[PDB]
Symmetry: D2
Subunit: 385 residues, 4 copies
């Protein structure tokens, strides 16, 4: 538990209602969502009604019309409840709706954003492939113009929400020879002829999200399915990832926060040598380092969100947030498990789950390594400035 730096009442109330939602709707289902690898359909629907799946989306498109600070706060609060619910919400907000928001036509937004703001339909984000994730520009899924259609061939890998999404923002090369000047974004309906979902990934964590390959074999979509112009798909993917990284940062904050909550509450009631673990100096330090890691990571997350909100550049900041929050989430969740001792290793405590859930935040939407590359490039640019 931290000190809201100076939050406006709108985001204060947003935090509370999300926290209330997460504690009422997500905390009791988080264990089943993870153990039964069960997509939290009912809750995602209720979240859509609340505008949580479309926070940055203008209301006239059916969204909540909030900002990315709001999103960061909601994302942390939801992911505190359920990390899977969190990334599901994050994919829809950041990775699916975001690029259609930033790059669609009016027609595209009306048809692909608005039907995906209420929880009845969620989207997904298909950039990674089996051969390339970090090397996103190596996308070898092809899109070929033919007739009134784009013809998509290839396999997209690791698509969060693959098994629940009704639409996908897919990145395919419209020319591989052009490299990352040859990627394009396509709005793809799901399901649609030519599109086979791969087997669900058996995941370490965020087990309530589906992750699967999108398999395009001669998958034909209208020519106006392209998002933006041919070739700007990479920049679309990158800028979407900049915003998304704020969401994953906030997801990581959630996991971190709930792991710290679990560690504290357990340490206050677990007894050692006649007194709570929180009397042990060693436990105190762990808690202190967890709090510091977490609040540090949140300030970075808020910074990136606030920068994006204020139309300031935020790539470095989003990456730092995503990096710090993710490594905090693992570190905190690792230490939550440790503070719980034996109980940290077992399923009748949520700590092992946070640890598993935390792990993913270091990986997708750009691994920690990629985040550091992103940070270093922008740090260096700012110095040559």
């Amino acid at each position: 538990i931290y000190q809201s730096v100076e939050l406006p009442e709108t985001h204060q109330m947003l935090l509370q209602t999300c926290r209330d939602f997460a504690e009422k709707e997500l905390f009791p289902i988080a264990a089943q969502v993870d153990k039964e690898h069960l997509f939290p359909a009912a809750q995602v629907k209720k979240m859509g009604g609340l505008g949580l799946l479309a926070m940055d989306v203008p209301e006239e498109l059916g969204g909540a019309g909030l900002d990315y600070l709001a999103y960061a706060i909601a994302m942390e609060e939801i992911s505190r409840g359920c990390a899977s619910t969190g990334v599901i919400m994050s994919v829809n907000n950041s990775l699916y709706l975001g690029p259609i928001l930033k790059f669609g036509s009016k027609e595209q937004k009306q048809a692909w954003v608005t039907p995906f703001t209420s929880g009845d339909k969620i989207g997904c984000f298909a950039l990674s492939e089996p051969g390339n994730g970090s090397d996103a520009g190596a996308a070898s899924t092809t899109a070929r113009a033919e007739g009134d259609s784009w013809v998509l061939n290839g396999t997209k890998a690791w698509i969060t929400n693959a098994w629940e999404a009704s639409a996908a923002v897919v990145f395919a090369s419209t020319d591989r020879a052009l490299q990352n000047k040859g990627i394009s974004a396509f709005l793809v309906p799901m399901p649609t002829p030519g599109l086979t979902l791969g087997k669900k990934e058996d995941k370490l964590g965020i087990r309530g999200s589906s992750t699967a390959n999108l398999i395009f074999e001669d998958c034909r979509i209208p020519k106006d399915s392209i998002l933006g112009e041919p070739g700007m798909g990479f920049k679309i993917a990158m800028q979407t990832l900049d915003m998304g990284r704020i969401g994953i940062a906030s997801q990581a904050l959630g996991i971190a926060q709930t792991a710290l909550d679990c560690a504290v509450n357990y340490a206050e009631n677990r007894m050692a040598f006649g007194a709570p673990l929180t009397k042990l100096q060693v436990i105190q330090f762990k808690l202190a380092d967890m709090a510091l890691a977490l609040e540090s990571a949140r300030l970075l997350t808020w910074r990136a969100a606030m920068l994006k909100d204020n139309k300031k550049p935020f790539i470095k900041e989003a990456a730092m947030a995503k990096l710090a929050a993710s490594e905090a989430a693992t570190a905190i969740s690792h230490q939550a498990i440790q503070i719980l001792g034996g109980m940290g290793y077992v399923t009748e405590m949520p700590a092992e789950r946070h640890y598993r859930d935390a792990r993913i935040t270091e990986i997708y939407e750009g691994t920690s390594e990629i985040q550091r590359l992103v940070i270093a490039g922008h740090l260096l640019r700012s110095y040559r400035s």
Copy 2:
């Protein structure tokens, strides 16, 4: 026994034993590791094959059915075995260090014949019941009691977290024979399983080492023969602590195996995965991770072999065992954490074994004394060294 160079070039019996165990782990444990994890399946047949190989009773004299090996051999074997499967390794480690260990060290000849020998071949394994629900870190505070009743002890209380609980035919159980004497009032008991008065709690559903069973031993007025006490009354604290010292060598080696296989996985994967036109191992940060993993791992192994070797040479090894277990456990998590990282998306899914090694490594920082406990044990003996 043991020269200092033996730390650097294994005696060839140990080199042979390494190859034998690697071969066994690769052929017998590697193919089933995922299954053992996914299905929380006790590897009964592999434990039996290991028993036939002596791996379940390494330090046990051949006179009693053991391999007649040493702790260096055990550390090496625990590494290779746990490299194949962390669960198998722990099962093996509990039987060697935690069950057989105290009996070889503190038991009478008769107790070794009855309690060690039938547990040397993989047909029966033991377990070690020291922790209790309210206390897993203090080996000096058992609320489970052992009251003397004529030709028997009567055990009452719940031991917590017993690895092999659902497969062990016997338990070294620590109970308080004299609550008032606190840490001077604990005794060690050889307990048959099953036995009247002993109920097993439900299997714990774990993060890893999923092939191992973990459950409480609920003793409700459970009678055991009088001569089931290990050592004398009151010696339970020392027995538990001295068993934990040997066990930590086993856990450290277990962590070495988890770390080594995670590193193996990372290296093989980084060598065969491309990004930005080259193999991951061309990336400097990947090279640095692998280097850090190898360094962490080889350090922890040197610490582990040192602990084993000191035990082999009849030397004190509390601090060195705790250092081994601490170093290897933390290396096992870090190395396995980084193996996941090197695999990227693959490190998060069951296509690859990396997330299993992560989950598996996690336990090594907990059991047989948490890292915090290991640091307390290290500090306390470091300071004793200066005094």
Copy 3:
């Protein structure tokens, strides 16, 4: 706000202090460290600019700024010179801070105002040879006798001891009341019964003086007491809460200048065909230094703004100080590392940044004490 648009005053102040640091501190920082030279001239100029009395109101001769401004100035000043930084930090937070918040009108007139312009600076005497972290164990005593407090005991490690003209001194008016028995005293320097110990030969911030305050039958007037008797511990702790924001910002400056040095050097140092910044591990190092520095800065700013907004900030002050101090060591360690051999010698400022960073993990409450402070407030907020 933080990065997200700093208020115009603060941005201006940042440029002002960056202008000052680069123009007046950067050229002398190496000499200040090497010759353990108190930067009197620079401190006087800083006094003119209001940097020695930033939170102090204009009426008392202060800059009328806030702690966000303070922290910013502290970072920019300490970027230039770490010793200059702590000298300014002691005066602002540790000396002027408690007098502003706890002194009478008369004490503020007599002890704040003459210390707002750089002509006189103060210091802060809490730690003792026997105890620093255990601040409440102050065994220096103050005994009421007549119109006078009688001070006996050694205060240890007093920054600005050899240049300050007043000390906020913490002596126990009754050791049996423990940290309820401590009082805070305005002690002029020099004064009879007060002897300065010899200057500590320090690892870094070598331009600050650090020396013991030896009180032997040292009589000050009865109204030298800051607040009421027994308030000294809370005065010390609340002063340190503010001070930790200053040291956090000193750490930010050392870290930032270590990072500046590292980036600039790696940009121009060639290895295997190109600049060190093309090497991936160098990029990661720099990325981690930047992330450590920025997050710690945010924490620092959080704390500062909290204090400015009259909100609780003990945990946040401690977090800022801990994170910035460890970042400053980590960053300055890696700045050295990035410079290679140049990191180890005086041709480069890196080795000094390393030496200066190290102190930020110690004084105004060790990282360990800070972590306890964080733990206590974290736990209290869950209860």
Copy 4:
């Protein structure tokens, strides 16, 4: 104290002999050697008479006839006394005598090893150059063949013992076109015509050692000055560094040991909050971490040493030893400072010196980065084997 499986009685006695020498002869002067940047000439000569400057050197040639395990033990005990004395000694053993023993002719050994075994003359090692300290195969310093002589041109950088050495092993390109394979190693007398010493470096630590550039301007040396064959210089430099890294690892052990010594003794005797520091769990934890890191690095160091003694490969292991021990020295010396509190920041205690001395061990004889590159390289080539 730490434990080991055994030391051979030779190495046990040597440990005591060195520990006795360090506490008696080095401990009293270590603060002054550092503070006055004072070359411990007398202690070095006394060590010369003990064999410490020529430990792996055949007795035939005036050396101790010991091995690198003994050397590692002695380096640690010496560096535990004085980090400057340690490096002066390490340079002579590993960097100067080492390559001559390994690659010199019997005559070169007689001329260049034997007069440097007893402390009257010490050597140095001139590999780095101002523009290149991490690339042992890119010497800009040239050695042109001129009949029965070699002519050296260029500046070697950062030469430890530069102002005290009577000889240098100097690496200079004898065929710049051959890059990697066009380095050669040379025995250069000091002083010698054409060799000018640069101004002494003013260093964070090991301030009792001298560090200066070796400026060679048409420096002529006999033909027989070349160590091994032309083009062998990169191999000689690399295998010399392998040996030297064991020495530096050992120096870092001693610095780490004396730092932990200092911290343990201090924490056992400093009270805070009514009890000694060592009753504080975090001090205990620090001490534990320092002890582990120390003894772990020592095992790594002795492994590299014994591998060398047993004429086994040890590039990875020497790099690991040096890497772990140098980072241990810095972390342990950092933590020693912390444990001392204010005392750790001032010359009243030696902690701050250990901190400063430790810092060099992460830099010379291959930075931590290069060590990790070396580790990575050989780990991979082990895997590809």
